[PDB]
């Protein structure tokens, strides 16, 4: 085992047992790998913009006799990178350029073109791009598009009991759902009549489709029914008997011949009867005419002489009909098999309901019912029918849709065309009829084998296709009417439809979620989020328990714990840890390939449908280190059912115990001991924690942090191995070792760490370094810790020392008692960065100005303002201070005053100004500062690179004519022709000299371009001239009313900041920080937080022993002696660490990083048992009970009986009180109705709902109601007269009449209604 340098600082003790055979994959690959499939061109045009184009192009005008065809598309590089684009507020996108080849053919000649015009990649639109963190920048705002989950295209069969007519019976209905086209549903009437409908239109007979498919009633009957034959030879009407057709049914009539009678009238038929009959050659048998009368014929049979219909398809025969038709010369009669249980007449029943006759009749009826108000026509009914289900423009089964369809039809082949075929619909109907006969099973709609996941690279593709369809619609007409001679492909198309479509999708779609950048965990769990909502899906208000409830196939693919409880439980899901999306779009999960009696180290991915065909061993099964199941019989799940199976019968095994959970639940320790409700609450709350100021580490984790913090994209990660050369908390420069250095490149890699920057939740996301100058790093190591991360491990909150006890009721049932020490240590203080903008527009009366010469203001408020009229950076401000000196023409004192309540430090001011208007002085100063910084950055880059390059040149010049005097004589730049033989060293020198010249020119051009960009007058788009941005930093501490929470679903607002004296202290004098309530533990069944607390105590105890051994100058050999014992303790744990190889330098470093408690890992379902917790407590001098006796600080008495004390990891949730406390006396009033405004950002009052009115009426309070609904809110005249009296001290109201009511009257008086007040 080898430990990486980032890992080789805190060797977290692990209590796992199973060896993790497959490491957790990249957690954001769900996004990128999808968008990667989108932007990349592919000769297999499918899955990309090339697929979208081929689905549209080539496009031709039939009247025009000329086409234009797509050639290729090349994507221009983004104009602005992520940082600049976010700062300025533009979108991060790329320009799309498409080669269109306009070919003009010639009339009276073959398609030999007169001329073809290939446009050089004409501009087509701007498509947004996915940043490497997996997010899109649309308007500076950073967005994440959730992957959607919906029903896969194909055919689905469903039936219900009670929901339809309640009469015991179930109605079977089949649906055909194309990927893009019209729905087609077949259904059975309660009287077994089969009908069809399109897009849930009116019911139409099913057979009409076959009439549309040009099938005669004879053809249909032959397709669907079986033939039973009667002959008029050797006897009157003998029957061809098929003995298997008679089984179970009572033989209700005589059948006897050839000696022995098989079955007489009135008896059933069994197998031995069938065998006797088969021996009897029952090809012809005697039946009475009555049995022959009940049949229905299969074919038309006309009078051969007169040529008139004597029998027709589906015509029911009778004795006289039989005699007549046989006399006419049709001696071989064929009838339909119509066994009630087996061969129902459903198609014939539809025939009886059919009012149509033939293909013309079918088309007429289809046209009339499809388009009321539209007259049918032979040439147009085809234009409707073919477009319905056979034309590519309005029908296309996707590849996955066709695969699922063929699977549903048990076809041998899955590669089929997207358009339906006659045999396809015939097979669908046949399966439907078989299901009606009961020879099949209905599918499950909410089964993961029927619902597939659409991601960004598919929804964006569909939106692009919609845009291209609109563009084709326009340009087909343009080419039909265009002269085709002066036209060029740029004239044919305009970007506007495509640009608008993609822009709307990426800006305001239902799935273009605004990112909740509260912390790295929120980012990851939002990027891997799965939604059943959105277009083409269901809605939060029209879904029932069926789709919400969990499913036996969710195992290994969807987290059953992390769902947003509330309005949309079960509709928004989080993808499991190991799950990945199949090629077709389904979710597949890896299972260990179990071979015979051994569990191999071979991972095969199984989908939701394949999993039923196997038997899967649970991941908790033990193996004998040879791969064999130690248990003779092992519990396994086969078809949703789970039960025991014998060894060497199982076929697969889950790859890890964490395969069932998601990252949010994976981070929670002791998840096995928590009731699922509290697990859900903890998982939901963990992503709401605000990044504290000094987040350090969790004492008890699950080891998932080492991945969640790395893959979040918020921590600076070493791209290549090397040695650190310089760090200044802003830029970490690494000397990447030559083993991975490009021969011509710099060989030195910068890392410009991001400092305090506002997040989507108004939090700071600065990254701080953790490596030291000269420290070696390897590729993938975390260099700089981001927010909520420290030393490469995710750390949302702080580990507080908590005790479980009632304390005078200040922890009453949700409340939390917090010692003053934790607020003295700045345990929970956090920075909030608010952004306030002061805009200025070129109004109709003249252009506005920003100036310190504002009218009607004294120098008191101007003290913070500068000579230009903007606050000096670093000035501390409070609510009401002027931050911007704007003036409006014709003058008015419109200026940005700080919003009430908030107060903090102004740390940034960016002023974006539209040019033409002169720039204010401070804008000039800020621009000059930016330009100086950019020039300094570029110059430092070039000069450090020049130093490295010149040093390399001198190193090359060491061998090959080294001359120290001639080398240090001249400046290093005049080394063009230094003394060196006619070898390849001079060639390397010339190569590096050309490289240096290229670096010179690149430095020059980049500097000039950057200067032009910064000096550019920023585009203030809608009639606006200048905007000034201000950023305020508020260092919010923790106060009563703030909300804290554990990881085990325990939450509550802190009720008192108890001073240090009043807190309980143990016999060592150490006071506890937080006093929790015990009664909440047994009620909500979240016992996990208890055990963790106990373990946490031991986790600190080890540290308490190390710190002393560090405080006391122990010799390292002894120190190591202790630490190794703390690591080798436990069962046969998976992790094994030998501290000997640490050379005592890494030992001392680890101790310096361990003296604050040894971090411990407790995997989700492979966690530490109580025995190991007791053993670890025994290693320290701590009590093995877990409970200690405490002393009340106020009275010095000892609490009766010991109490539980430990270190619980607590998180400050983002629901602090100062964002929610509000009160209104008098202020803004709404216009249409004079009721007060509503909200916090507006000075509004609380809404007095109808329930409150009912409650007031429940008491006898009438004056209270009258005041509350007339004076306080509605009566404009009254609420002033009340104001005067209250100031005057009269306390009397004049109610009048609520103005809103009068408005209602006008709304009714605006109609043809005369409603008015009355006197008497």
């Amino acid at each position: 085992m080898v430990y990486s340098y980032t890992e080789k600082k805190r060797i977290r003790k692990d209590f796992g047992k199973r060896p993790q055979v497959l490491d957790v994959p990249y957690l954001l690959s769900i996004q990128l790998d999808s968008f990667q499939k989108f932007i990349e061109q592919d000769p297999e045009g499918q899955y990309g913009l090339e697929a979208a184009f081929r689905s549209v192009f080539p496009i031709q005008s039939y009247s025009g006799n000329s086409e234009l065809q797509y050639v290729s598309y090349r994507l221009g590089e983004p104009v602005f990178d992520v940082q600049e684009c976010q700062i300025r507020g533009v979108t991060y996108s790329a320009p799309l350029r498409v080669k269109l080849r306009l070919v003009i053919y010639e009339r009276e000649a073959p398609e030999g073109t007169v001329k073809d015009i290939k446009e050089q990649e004409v501009y087509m639109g701007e498509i947004p791009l996915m940043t490497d963190n997996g997010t899109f920048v649309i308007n500076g705002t950073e967005r994440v598009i959730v992957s959607q989950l919906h029903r896969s295209p194909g055919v689905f069969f469903d039936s219900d009991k009670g929901k339809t007519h309640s009469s015991g019976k179930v109605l079977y209905n089949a649906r055909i759902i194309p990927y893009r086209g019209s729905w087609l549903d077949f259904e059975f009437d309660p009287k077994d009549n089969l009908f069809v409908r399109i897009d849930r239109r009116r019911k139409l007979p099913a057979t009409i489709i076959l009439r549309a498919l040009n099938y005669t009633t004879e053809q249909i009957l032959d397709l669907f029914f079986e033939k039973v034959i009667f002959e008029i030879r050797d006897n009157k009407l003998q029957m061809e008997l098929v003995p298997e057709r008679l089984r179970g049914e009572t033989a209700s009539f005589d059948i006897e011949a050839n000696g022995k009678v098989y079955v007489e009238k009135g008896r059933r038929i069994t197998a031995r009867h069938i065998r006797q009959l088969e021996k009897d050659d029952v090809k012809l048998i005697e039946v009475p005419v009555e049995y022959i009368a009940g049949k229905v014929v299969a074919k038309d049979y006309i009078d051969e002489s007169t040529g008139e219909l004597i029998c027709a398809a589906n015509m029911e025969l009778s004795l006289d009909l039989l005699a007549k038709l046989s006399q006419s010369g049709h001696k071989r009669i064929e009838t339909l098999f119509t066994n009630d249980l087996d061969h129902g007449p459903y198609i014939s029943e539809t025939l009886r309901v059919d009012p149509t006759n033939d293909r013309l009749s079918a088309l007429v009826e289809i046209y009339r019912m499809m388009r009321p108000g539209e007259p049918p026509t032979r040439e147009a009914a085809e234009s409707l029918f073919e477009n319905l289900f056979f034309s590519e423009d309005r029908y296309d089964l996707s590849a996955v849709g066709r695969m699922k369809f063929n699977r549903s039809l048990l076809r041998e082949e899955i590669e089929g065309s997207g358009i339906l075929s006659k045999d396809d619909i015939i097979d669908v109907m046949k399966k439907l009829i078989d299901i009606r006969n009961g020879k099949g099973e209905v599918d499950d709609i909410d089964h993961l084998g029927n619902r597939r996941i659409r991601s960004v690279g598919e929804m964006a593709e569909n939106q692009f296709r919609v845009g291209l369809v609109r563009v084709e619609r326009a340009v087909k007409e343009r080419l039909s009417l265009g002269d085709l001679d002066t036209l060029m492909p740029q004239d044919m198309i305009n970007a506007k439809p495509i640009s608008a479509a993609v822009k709307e999708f990426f800006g305001s779609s239902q799935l273009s979620q605004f990112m909740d950048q509260n912390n790295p965990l929120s980012e990851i769990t939002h990027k891997r989020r799965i939604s059943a909502l959105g277009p083409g899906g269901l809605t939060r208000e029209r879904a029932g328990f069926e789709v919400r409830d969990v499913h036996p196939t969710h195992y290994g693919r969807v987290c059953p714990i992390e769902t947003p409880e509330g309005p949309n439980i079960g509709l928004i899901n989080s993808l499991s840890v190991y799950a990945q999306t199949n090629e077709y779009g389904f979710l597949e999960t890896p299972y260990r390939k179990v071979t015979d009696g051994v569990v191999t180290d071979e991972i095969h991915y199984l989908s939701a449908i394949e999993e039923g065909n196997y038997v899967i061993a649970q991941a908790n099964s033990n193996l004998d280190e040879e791969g064999h199941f130690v248990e003779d019989l092992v519990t396994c799940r086969s078809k949703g059912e789970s039960s025991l199976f014998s060894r060497d019968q199982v076929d697969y095994m889950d790859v890890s115990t964490q395969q069932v959970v998601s990252v949010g639940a994976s981070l929670i320790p002791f998840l096995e001991h928590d009731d699922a409700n509290r697990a859900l609450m903890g998982a939901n709350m963990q992503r709401q924690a605000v990044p504290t100021l000094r987040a350090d580490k969790p004492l008890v984790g699950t080891g998932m942090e080492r991945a969640v913090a790395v893959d979040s994209g918020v921590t600076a990660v070493a791209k290549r191995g090397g040695v650190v050369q310089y760090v200044d908390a802003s830029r970490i420069v690494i000397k990447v070792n030559e083993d991975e250095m490009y021969p011509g490149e710099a060989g030195i890699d910068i890392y410009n760490l991001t400092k305090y920057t506002r997040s989507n939740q108004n939090t700071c996301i600065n990254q701080m370094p953790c490596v030291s100058l000269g420290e070696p790093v390897e590729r993938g190591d975390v260099l700089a810790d981001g927010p909520s991360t420290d030393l490469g491990e995710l750390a949302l909150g702080q580990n507080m020392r908590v005790a479980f006890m009632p304390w005078n009721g200040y922890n009453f049932e949700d409340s939390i008692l917090v010692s003053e020490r934790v607020v003295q240590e700045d345990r929970f203080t956090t920075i909030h960065i608010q952004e306030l903008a002061c805009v200025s527009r070129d109004t109709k009366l003249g252009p506005e100005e920003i100036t310190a010469d504002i009218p009607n203001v004294g120098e008191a408020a101007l003290s913070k303002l500068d000579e230009s009229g903007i606050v000096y950076i670093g000035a501390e401000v409070t609510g009401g201070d002027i931050l911007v000196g704007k003036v409006t023409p014709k003058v008015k004192d419109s200026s940005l005053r700080v919003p009430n309540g908030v107060s903090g430090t102004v740390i940034d001011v960016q002023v974006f100004t539209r040019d033409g208007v002169e720039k204010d002085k401070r804008a000039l100063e800020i621009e000059e500062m930016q330009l100086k910084q950019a020039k300094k950055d570029l110059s430092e880059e070039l000069q450090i690179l020049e130093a490295g390059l010149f040093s390399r040149i001198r190193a090359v010049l060491v061998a090959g004519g080294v001359e120290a005097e001639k080398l240090d004589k001249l400046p290093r730049d005049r080394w063009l022709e230094l003394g060196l033989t006619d070898e390849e060293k001079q060639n390397q020198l010339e190569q590096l000299a050309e490289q240096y010249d290229e670096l010179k020119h690149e430095f020059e051009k980049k500097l000039e371009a950057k200067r032009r960009k910064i000096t550019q007058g920023d585009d203030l788009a809608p009639g606006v001239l200048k905007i000034v941005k201000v950023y305020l930093a508020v260092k919010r501490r923790i106060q009563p009313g703030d909300k804290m929470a554990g990881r085990h679903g325990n939450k509550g607002v802190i009720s008192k900041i108890n001073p240090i004296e009043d807190m309980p202290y143990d016999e060592n004098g150490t006071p506890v920080d937080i006093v929790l309530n015990p009664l909440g533990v047994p009620s909500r069944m979240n016992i996990g937080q208890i055990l963790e607390t106990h373990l946490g105590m031991a986790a600190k105890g080890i540290g308490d022993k190390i710190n002393a051994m560090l405080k006391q100058q122990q010799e390292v050999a002894k120190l190591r002696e202790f630490i190794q014992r703390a690591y080798d303790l436990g069962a046969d744990v998976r992790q094994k660490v030998d501290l000997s190889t640490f050379s005592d330098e890494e030992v001392m470093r680890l101790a310096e990083n361990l003296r604050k408690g040894m971090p411990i890992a407790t995997p989700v379902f492979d966690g530490a048992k109580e025995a190991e917790i007791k053993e670890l407590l025994k290693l320290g001098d701590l009590p093995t009970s877990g409970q200690i006796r405490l002393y009340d600080g106020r009275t010095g008495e000892q609490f009766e009986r010991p109490v539980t004390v430990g270190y619980m990891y607590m998180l400050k949730l983002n629901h602090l009180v100062d964002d929610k406390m509000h009160a209104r006396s008098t202020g803004s009033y709404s216009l249409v109705t004079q009721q007060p405004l509503g909200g916090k950002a507006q000075f509004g009052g609380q809404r007095f709902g109808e329930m409150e009115v009912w409650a007031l009426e429940a008491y006898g309070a009438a004056y209270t109601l009258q005041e509350m609904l007339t004076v306080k809110s509605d009566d404009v005249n009254g609420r002033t007269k009340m104001y005067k009296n209250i100031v005057d001290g009269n306390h009397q109201m004049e109610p009048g009449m609520p103005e809103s009511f009068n408005v209602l009257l006008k709304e009714i008086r605006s109609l043809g209604i005369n409603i008015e007040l009355e006197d008497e």
Binding site: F545, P806, F1248, Y1263
Partner: protein
Amino acid sequence: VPLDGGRFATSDLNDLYRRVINRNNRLKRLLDLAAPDIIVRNEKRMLQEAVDALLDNGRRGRAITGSNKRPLKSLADMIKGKQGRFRQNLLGKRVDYSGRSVITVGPYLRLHQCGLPKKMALELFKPFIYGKLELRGLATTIKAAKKMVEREEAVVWDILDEVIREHPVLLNRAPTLHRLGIQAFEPVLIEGKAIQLHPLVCAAYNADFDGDQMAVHVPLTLEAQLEARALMMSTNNILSPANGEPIIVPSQDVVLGLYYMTRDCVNAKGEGMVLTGPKEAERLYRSGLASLHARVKVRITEYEKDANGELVAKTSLKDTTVGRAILWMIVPKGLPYSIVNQALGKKAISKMLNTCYRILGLKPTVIFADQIMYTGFAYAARSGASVGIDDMVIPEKKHEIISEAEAEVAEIQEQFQSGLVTAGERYNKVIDIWAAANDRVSKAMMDNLQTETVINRDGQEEKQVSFNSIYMMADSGARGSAAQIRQLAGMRGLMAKPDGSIIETPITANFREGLNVLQYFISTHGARKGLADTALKTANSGYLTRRLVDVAQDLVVTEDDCGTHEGIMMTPVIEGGDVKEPLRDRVLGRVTAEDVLKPGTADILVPRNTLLHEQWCDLLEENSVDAVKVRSVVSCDTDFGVCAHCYGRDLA
């Protein structure tokens, strides 16, 4: 209205009127120019459809829109609807002089007080402060008074402390299903920003303090203040209007303290001595010479009010515990000692409090409740009843009970392996055997929990009730009933599929032990089913409430006696064999319909129109009366109202 920049916000009605005006002007222009009949007919149809879109947009074939398929709101749309005027601005309207904040529990408050932040008090009582600044003469007018208030001058805080002296504030939590969700409180200034709420009141609001926001409204006029103090004050709402049940039922933490204080142990420090009075007993505890659960003889004195209503003092020696003798110093001077001579729990205490309201009255009852809360909190803090993994006990026989029970299922499987049983019978035998095993496991676990305590009384071991933390939490009724401790220490038991089928293989583990992956996945079914049930039923409940209020809003008690003599006969509910509720519950608080007869013949017992209060209910239960006809609101013959005699007792 304009928006940011030189543009005006789109108005729905304006566009409909514009369409109508344009179409009508076109029709007028044509009719002036004599357009052909076809054209004028088409214009008239378009005008009619435009008027249709203006009036009730949506009743047309398709609503018109000027955006991404967002139909325009019409006049009829604005009139009705959940966002319409009726339910948006008339029935419920936003009110000035109100605010909201996150609440927190202040145990020091009296029953009739609540703490509010100084900032919120200043921002709600602003005009009242002005009303003093002029009256004090400290400010010239409003112009200087507002400035001084902004200056937050230290004198302004004195003005606030004078204004807020006796001015009630209304507190209501959203939602407010019943009238007890809105109450008046006398405010007290608090430094912080959270609203200090009383513990005993939090039950009425259903207020968990896990970040729960709550709103305050300031009654301004004189009549509003008086109405708040007389009808909505906390101390005026001690009985629930839905049934004769107090709403000040002792909280979860307080009852734990009382249960811990009054419990008795076999052998304890300070046992068996004689105490001259309750006060001395307290001293002993605070000097540390005696244990709270020690058994002792203290001289008790109690007062009993005669039939006329004057207290009679009686003093005696009583065998009791030190905790009970200490608590007796709080119980008012009208109750028997037998109420406190027992280990009190959330049930046993409640009737106690109720008995006070039955005897002493409202004013003694409220102070007694406050003292009970104080004592409970203090002695629960002294208890330190922590909870730990050591307290969850797994009975040792459990492994055997499983090892046998599964084997029995094997036998039921063996029959299925031999064809000796049907498919369904195997299922319904296995599930029943598992249920019996679960019952055995639960009984063994409970027996072990209570038996885990055995103590030596000067010689030989003797068992007693268990001081186990979980056991005291469950037995006191605070939290964690038997179904909780059974899942925490017995076995989780059977589960159900989303289709409701009983799982053949129960969750044989308990949360103290680890649940495996499959067991947790099985539990997720029931967890999500319950969560979805809550999220879906929270809407139907509210809709039913709205229907009820809008069907019954008219009825008011508007007359004393209607004079009728009919009614409805009340009998105990006897169904499924034994009775499910007594006669007293039905008939208490109503008036008799006719003269109540003695059990037998020709002898009456109660007058024909007498209210059957508690004493007469006891008198009836003394006799063998099962059917009693009493007047009912349905039968009362009062026009456009309901007579008072039919409705009877006001339950609050």
